[PDB]
RNA sequence: AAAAAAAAUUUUUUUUAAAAAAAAAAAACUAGAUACUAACACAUUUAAUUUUUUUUUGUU
């Protein structure tokens, strides 16, 4: 819907269902949302971009991490900086919620790609995921 | 008494050569070309409180 009051108040409502009732919409519906959010964090506002990243955790918990990551890592190729940083946060959030062992070999593989913007976005994603799993990190 | 199958030692010349023990670009000036970095900032902001300034001049 563009605008903002709608984007913010919706993202908080969608993420609510990800917490409370994940099992209702079928997982192909959660994937329809993960694309609509991944386009939505172009937004100029912050609280939008922040809530959009939090609801990848709620979806990754619901359906699965690997369906979601491939959606995100395909988005690091993109030029514009917010999109690469706000995907790099989400990979950090998908790591914490679903476990880093699920995320990490997929990210270490993606680092091989010869484009530079992926290679920072894979290093920035690893920064975030090491502050969100605080103590773990040792393994 | 006279007519048939197996064997060993010591001395001498050379032709199509090689090897490089490992550091380089500059700098300055002036303009142009293109990538990128900071969860950078980007719509809410406004219900106690200091820009509010004048030769004092508002009466039982």
From Swiss-Prot:
It comes from the Eukaryota. Disulfide bonds: none annotated. HEAT repeats lie at residues 1-23, 28-65, 98-135. It is found in: Nucleus. Belongs to the CWC complex (or CEF1-associated complex), a spliceosome sub-complex reminiscent of a late-stage spliceosome composed of the U2, U5 and U6 snRNAs and at least BUD13, BUD31, BRR2, CDC40, CEF1, CLF1, CUS1, CWC2, CWC15, CWC21, CWC22, CWC23, CWC24, CWC25, CWC27, ECM2, HSH155, IST3, ISY1, LEA1, MSL1, NTC20, PRP8, PRP9, PRP11, PRP19, PRP21, PRP22, PRP45, PRP46, SLU7, SMB1, SMD1, SMD2, SMD3, SMX2, SMX3, SNT309, SNU114, SPP2, SYF1, SYF2, RSE1 and YJU2. Interacts with RDS3. Belongs to the SF3B1 family. Present with 521 molecules/cell in log phase SD medium. Contacts pre-mRNA on both sides of the branch site early in spliceosome assembly. This is U2 snRNP component HSH155. The chain holds residues 695 to 833 of 971 of the full protein.
């Amino acid at each position: 819907n563009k605008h903002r009051k709608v984007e913010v108040n919706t993202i908080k409502f969608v993420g609510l269902i990800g917490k409370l009732a994940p099992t209702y919409a079928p997982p192909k519906e959660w994937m329809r949302i993960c694309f609509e959010l991944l386009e939505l964090l172009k937004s100029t506002n912050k609280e939008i971009r922040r809530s959009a990243n939090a609801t990848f955790g709620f979806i990754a918990e619901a359906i699965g991490p690997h369906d979601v990551l491939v959606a995100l890592l395909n988005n690091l190729k993109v030029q514009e900086r917010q999109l690469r940083v706000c995907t790099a946060v989400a990979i950090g959030i998908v790591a914490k919620v679903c476990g880093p062992y699920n995320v990490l070999p997929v990210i270490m593989n993606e680092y091989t790609t010869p484009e530079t913007n992926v290679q920072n976005g894979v290093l920035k994603a690893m920064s975030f995921m090491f502050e969100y799993i605080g103590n773990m990190s040792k393994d």
